[PDB]
Amino acid sequence: RDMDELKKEVSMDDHKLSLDELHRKYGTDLSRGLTPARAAEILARDGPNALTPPPTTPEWVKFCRQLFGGFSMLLWIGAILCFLAYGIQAATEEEPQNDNLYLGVVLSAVVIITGCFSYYQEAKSSKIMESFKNMVPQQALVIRNGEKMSINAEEVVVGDLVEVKGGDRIPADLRIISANGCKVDNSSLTGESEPQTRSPDFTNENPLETRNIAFFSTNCVEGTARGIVVYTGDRTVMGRIATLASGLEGGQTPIAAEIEHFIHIITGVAVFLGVSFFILSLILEYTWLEAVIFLIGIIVANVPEGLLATVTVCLTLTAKRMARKNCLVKNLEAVETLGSTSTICSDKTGTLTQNRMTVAHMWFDNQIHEADTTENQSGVSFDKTSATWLALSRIAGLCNRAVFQANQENLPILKRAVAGDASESALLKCIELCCGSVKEMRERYTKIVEIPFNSTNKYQLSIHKNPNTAEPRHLLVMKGAPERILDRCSSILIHGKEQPLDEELKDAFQNAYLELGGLGERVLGFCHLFLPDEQFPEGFQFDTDDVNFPLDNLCFVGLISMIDPPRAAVPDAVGKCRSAGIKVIMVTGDHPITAKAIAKGVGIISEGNETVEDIAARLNIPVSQVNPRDAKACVVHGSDLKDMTSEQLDDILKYHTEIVFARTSPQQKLIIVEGCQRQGAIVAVTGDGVNDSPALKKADIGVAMGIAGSDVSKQAADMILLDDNFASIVTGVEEGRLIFDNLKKSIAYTLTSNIPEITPFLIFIIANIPLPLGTVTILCIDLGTDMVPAISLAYEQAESDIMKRQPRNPKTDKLVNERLISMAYGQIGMIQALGGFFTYFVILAENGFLPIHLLGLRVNWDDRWINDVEDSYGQQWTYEQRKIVEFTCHTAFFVSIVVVQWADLVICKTRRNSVFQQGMKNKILIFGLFEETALAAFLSYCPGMGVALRMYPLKPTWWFCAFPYSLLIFVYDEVRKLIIRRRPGGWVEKETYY
Amino acid sequence: MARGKAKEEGSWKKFIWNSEKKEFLGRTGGSWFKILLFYVIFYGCLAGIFIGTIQVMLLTISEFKPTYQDRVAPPGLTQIPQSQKTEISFRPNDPQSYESYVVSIVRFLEKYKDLAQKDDMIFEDCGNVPSELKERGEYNNERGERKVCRFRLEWLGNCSGLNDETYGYKDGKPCVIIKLNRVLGFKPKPPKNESLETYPVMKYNPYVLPVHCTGKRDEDKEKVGTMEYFGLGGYPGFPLQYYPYYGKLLQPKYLQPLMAVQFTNLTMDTEIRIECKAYGENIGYSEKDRFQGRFDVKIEVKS
Amino acid sequence: DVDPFYYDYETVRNGGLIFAALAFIVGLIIILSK
Ligand SMILES: CC[C@H]1/C=C/C=C/C[C@@H](C)[C@H](O)[C@@](C)(O)C(=O)[C@@H](C)[C@H](O)[C@@H](C)C(=O)[C@@H](C)[C@H](O)[C@@H](C)/C=C/C(=O)O[C@@H]2[C@H](C)[C@H](CC1)O[C@]1(CC[C@H](C)[C@H](C[C@@H](C)O)O1)[C@H]2C
Ligand SMILES: CCCCCCCCCCCCCCCCCC(=O)OC[C@H](COP(=O)([O-])OCC[N+](C)(C)C)OC(=O)CCCCCCCCCCCCCCCCC
Ligand SMILES: CCCCCCCCCCCCCCCCCC(=O)OC[C@H](COP(=O)([O-])OCC[N+](C)(C)C)OC(=O)CCCCCCCCCCCCCCCCC
Ligand SMILES: CCCCCCCCCCCCCCCCCC(=O)OC[C@H](COP(=O)([O-])OCC[N+](C)(C)C)OC(=O)CCCCCCCCCCCCCCCCC
Ligand SMILES: CCCCCCCCCCCCCCCCCC(=O)OC[C@H](COP(=O)([O-])OCC[N+](C)(C)C)OC(=O)CCCCCCCCCCCCCCCCC
Ligand SMILES: CCCCCCCCCCCCCCCCCC(=O)OC[C@H](COP(=O)([O-])OCC[N+](C)(C)C)OC(=O)CCCCCCCCCCCCCCCCC
Ligand SMILES: CC(C)CCC[C@@H](C)[C@H]1CC[C@H]2[C@@H]3CC=C4C[C@@H](O)CC[C@]4(C)[C@H]3CC[C@]12C
Ligand SMILES: CC(C)CCC[C@@H](C)[C@H]1CC[C@H]2[C@@H]3CC=C4C[C@@H](O)CC[C@]4(C)[C@H]3CC[C@]12C
Ligand SMILES: CC(C)CCC[C@@H](C)[C@H]1CC[C@H]2[C@@H]3CC=C4C[C@@H](O)CC[C@]4(C)[C@H]3CC[C@]12C
Ligand SMILES: Nc1ncnc2c1ncn2[C@@H]1O[C@H](COP(=O)(O)OP(=O)(O)O)[C@@H](O)[C@H]1O
């Protein structure tokens, strides 16, 4: 069951109109298109091809979301019961305390400050991220007035004709005029992403079902088609749907998942304590109202309010950093994921390479020939007249399907812009500069049928009409994968005359490829066949879906090789990447020779490791004799992968260090990625072509080249390198690694405080001594040291070991693990707690009660009536008088915690390096330290702080009581991290490196 | 890689499962031991540093005098009947309704029996008239266990008796007994003629620290009672010759000055609030501490 | 001023408020370092 009925309701078309009918309706010539004039006219009449902006949310309502943001809302609950319990206080007693009044005031205040802070941060994210929503002007290719040109999709109007190819997004609702083997992705409209064919035929009365309408907001997977705009902008079927054509979507990143898992349990234990203390308090003769406030104080104390804001900041940071690197990131949480990368599976051409080809050598007549590679100012290095070079140049011309854009024929061939294959462009520009016009050549051999190139066939082919005299009336022409091309041949053309393909020439063919491919040039093979007359008469009906014509016994003519240099950054890019523990695997559809060559040139493969073919060659022994494991690197041809079991594919991954996958089908790109996933890795795919679609989707992270990319593949990805700068991947990965460290650092710090926040009340019972720390003071601990200092960590800069340490294990380095609880609870949490206890005993013993004396006093110390409380010196204390000291103890305990919270916030600044390597450059951390302590002085040395919050001044000696412990923390972690810097794999590391 | 790590486990049985090697969802008995030990020596030596640093502080206090006193600075006034909620409510005719009040007050006054102040070494005879501060010396171990200024049951007029087992105390019209809080090294200063009291300065400006029990506060109050102050020398206050106090270390059996107030009113079957007050220069009061230098006892002789 | 025994909290309190102003102000000056 669906809603497709409630979509076919408002539908009316012209999928029924004949071609002549169509023509007169819109007026456009079905083959030259519409005049730029008539275009410009319509555009002012109908407005740009763009859906009108759908308002998602308003400002102020987003503000309140943040204000009640998960933890924020829990705070209100407590704040409510605080005002609540205070109203009750003015009814059980005459003029009661001012504690709970002020407590409600502070608590609420924090929610506000926190809330409106996070809001403004998160607003800044969705300001910067949207600054990129309009940086990729979706181009469309139109044939206005004879020539064809690529414009902003917004300039496309009703009527003109569009040309979509493989992996192009469909720019408006079209009526297909013509099509060769076109397949469209209607997934966005009809669920199933299975390619649907588009022909010009009329196939179903329903506009949706029929095959001759391509819809706006879909894309065509592959094949090629021309069609005529029948719906611009909001008028298209997909503009008409008032749901969400572009904006909000799904997906839940692993880092998000980790966080949500942790918050679920940390909030659980935090309420387990609150109500266990709550009932414990009741048993301990706690008043009813102050029991619930003690509970609610506890909850807030074992619940990390910072986390959310901290996370928000970190995203806002990373969003600002990628922006300055022209890296469009669709979900900021995935930048994390990008850090956890163990394997980068990249494409060759248009990824590692610049995709700026220029023809350099030809193989024909058993010779190699050079053609002027840069600043040609001539034509090649052979006679332009050779019979062989002729027939070669013709099919490299004819079987080519690239053409210069509109209004170019007045400037140099190198200057004008092209449309189509970077390989074909090079083909074009070449022969255009040294032989003749391909425009006139193509028009002389009017093409009848063709099967346009696609990444899985690895050849293009067409039949053209021949107007020569030796013409047998039909000229078959194809190019592709040279190996593949040659394998369909029978004869080879030599000095004009074709003679059978003997074994020698085959081997010369191979040395040629080894030679030319070895320079790192891309090689293309070229052949043709003169279709024989008696078998193929004048009006012959060539069929191109059942192959009515020969695919075998062709006549091989030559190879042309083109230079395609590695992109600027790629070496240091894969360099640094490998040095970060990231395995870099080349996955290309190109030839193994050309593949390997670039592999070494960028350092996918380090010249020093050998391939079994290298090894075998070295010893002059069979290759199938070598022992695979003697090879650190390998070059796996996809025609052999086709015969791999998973275990075999798994094996080549598991046991080779530098892997290269050559001549891979698009699905084979997936399998590989799928294989690397299966091992327990986290893969990153970087592509550009439409053939990288499936792999970019499967991938743990897609990265598209934002320029040389295709529509579809940019859409698959999570990142689009707008500058086509491959080094953005590094920047990105480092950035990712950073979010994880900083976020973990935050949880490390924020969790220490819980133990001292709760050990007093526990000890209050187990030793029956005066409560060292109470409800009022607990909040202070929390909202004073576990807030601003926790957030500050997000602002904390990068360590120095990140791009030198192995990528994290998702099944070990969880954001929170036992090791992190080992520290924050078992080690550092404990110390901080002793610090408070120490100062507690000093204050009492200095004031008359030695620690040993303190056992038992609980019942009577808290008792409101015994005013003869005898200390160790035998002095007699009244109720409120010993409470003054107890509550002066509370103030100190808190203050002591602040002190140790410095050292903790310093060691939780770094996880590996020392704090002398890292260095105080996080000003926001410093800022936290001072304000945190000014607050501490303030809460104790302000008038009426003991009348309002039971907080009294300290004597100067008190402050230093906790100093010893604070230092013990700094140095313990310092030496701990030192042992780990100098003992990797060490027991120290394998237990305390949280 | 060829390195074997991660958790590609397919058994939630591993919670306890161990047929392979590791156990209790943990590691092996070699690391399940090793880390246990870590914490053993960690917490162990950590507890030592708490121990150690507590020790250092300890030798920064003299076991003769508290390093701080400003929090007990002015002393408070406390009675000996264990005030329920500052309230002494009972049914005069029935013995049961106050037997509690009696056992408390009787137990305390067994520290002051004549048979308890036997030996002349520990106990000294301070005159039968309130004198000036018998200054034992310097708060050290120089002079040993200082002498204890004795105090006889008989000074407390009418609230001493001499029965068999338990003291026969006041059933009709009760006996409240007031006491001063022991501050180590304290010397009471009785009021002169300037900052006078809520009442006419009863004699002994030199050596007695006055205590006067009126009704509820001083303003418009239902004053219905008959006060009667019993004490040493028959003066309504405290004998200065007992101070200063030299701590539990130097005065183990020190008996502090007592002073009773047999309340023999003229109104049964009702609760009345009565505020006692020790006046002086060394005595202070607090609006929050209802006991600091003063008293708010509410008694009900409802028969 | 001085007499029998007690602790001057007047100076301890004003001395601590002077500090609370140092920490507070230096704290802001760092986070706004031009
Ligand atoms: C940044 C925008 C925030 C959305 C704000 C919406 C405010 C409206 C308001 C009406 C809420 O819906 C709410 C008050 O009803 C609400 O939060 C409830 C669902 C919630 O159950 C509430 C009643 C609670 O009692 C709550 C305190 C829970 O007890 C507690 C276990 C969860 C707290 C928590 O921090 O959850 C976050 C947070 C809600 C966040 C919320 C984030 O949701 C969770 C959402 C999803 C992802 C995975 C995040 C991770 C990270 C991106 O924040 O984890 C998610 C992990
Ligand atoms: C009894 C207990 C009482 C305790 C009360 C404590 C209240 C704390 C409540 C939550 C605080 C959460 C705020 C997160 C920290 C933001 C850091 C940041 O860099 O801000 C700029 C960023 C700007 O974006 P930015 O971070 O990208 O730019 C930074 C540039 N420099 C380096 C120059 C600063 O955001 C803000 O503009 C938002 C404003 C929020 C500020 C909140 C102040 C806290 C209030 C009082 C706390 C105590 C100290 C007193 C001093 C007051 C003056 C500051
Ligand atoms: C009135 C009530 C009494 C008040 C007293 C208050 C004292 C309470 C103190 C705290 C208790 C909280 C327990 C710790 C929480 C840990 C949970 C967690 O998330 O771990 C999951 C994780 C799960 O991780 P996992 O999901 O990845 O699973 C791993 C396993 N494989 C790989 C096979 C899937 O568990 C662990 O591995 C950790 C093991 C810890 C060892 C034992 C845990 C429990 C022991 C102590 C509890 C005692 C109960 C006290 C209550 C008494 C009440 C009367
Ligand atoms: C009255 C008694 C008072 C006692 C006070 C005790 C205070 C201690 C509080 C509990 C500490 C644990 C906090 C939970 C934090 C959860 C964070 C989270 O993300 O979890 C994921 C993490 C996941 O990490 P992980 O992914 O590495 O875990 C799986 C890995 N393997 C398979 C190798 C195990 O889970 C944790 O590690 C949970 C920690 C458990 C540690 C056990 C603590 C023991 C509890 C205290 C003593 C018990 C006494 C019982 C006797 C009762 C008699 C009176
Ligand atoms: C490898 C790195 C090492 C670093 C270099 C080595 C530095 C020198 C070593 C020690 C430094 C001093 C501390 C140890 C002394 C212990 C004190 C003690 O006994 O405490 C109990 C005493 C108790 O003495 P008491 O027994 O007489 O009791 C009465 C005192 N009152 C009434 C005040 C309670 O406590 C105090 O009185 C101390 C508090 C005073 C106020 C301020 C103290 C700060 C002084 C330290 C600064 C360090 C110098 C460096 C310069 C810094 C300038 C920015
Ligand atoms: C009263 C006591 C006051 C003590 C306060 C002083 C702070 C230190 C306290 C405890 C000592 C621990 C410090 C070790 C820090 C490690 C730094 C490091 O990795 O160096 C290489 C770093 C890094 O060099 P790198 O950048 O070339 O990288 C190499 C790193 N390794 C070598 C690990 C592979 O060098 C430095 O940056 C130099 C600065 C650090 C020097 C430390 C200054 C003071 C610390 C020592 C004084 C205390 C005496 C020790 C006794 C303690 C017992 C009380
Ligand atoms: C209030 C006081 C008494 C609570 C004391 C809690 C102590 C016992 C708790 C707090 C944190 C705990 C540690 C937390 C994490 C680990 C890692 C695990 O692999 C071994 C158990 C161990 C080491 C736990 C042992 C007990 C532990 C140290
Ligand atoms: C290098 C290391 C070994 C030196 C050790 C010094 C330790 C013992 C010092 C450093 C700071 C000191 C504390 C600093 C302040 C106070 C307050 C005082 O009222 C009690 C003593 C006490 C608690 C001191 C006890 C000794 C102390 C903890
Ligand atoms: C190494 C760095 C982190 C140590 C910082 C130590 C600082 C914060 C210490 C050293 C001296 C301390 C001050 C020392 C004396 C007084 C007077 C007292 O009436 C109020 C507290 C106050 C004002 C103390 C606040 C904390 C203080 C300023
Ligand atoms: N326009 C084209 N026409 C014919 N053959 C082509 C064309 N483009 C590429 N080929 C050949 O087919 C191979 C398949 O390439 P593909 O599968 O897309 O990956 P890559 O683009 O990296 O080569 C190419 O390496 C080349 O040999």
Ligand code: ALF
């Ligand atoms: F450029 Al490729 F497969 F190497 F698309």
Ligand SMILES: [Mg+2]
């Ligand atoms: Mg490509």
Ligand SMILES: [Mg+2]
């Ligand atoms: Mg390609």
Ligand code: NA
């Ligand atoms: Na908290």
Ligand code: NA
């Ligand atoms: Na994915």
Ligand code: NA
């Ligand atoms: Na902390």
Ligand code: NA
């Ligand atoms: Na906390």
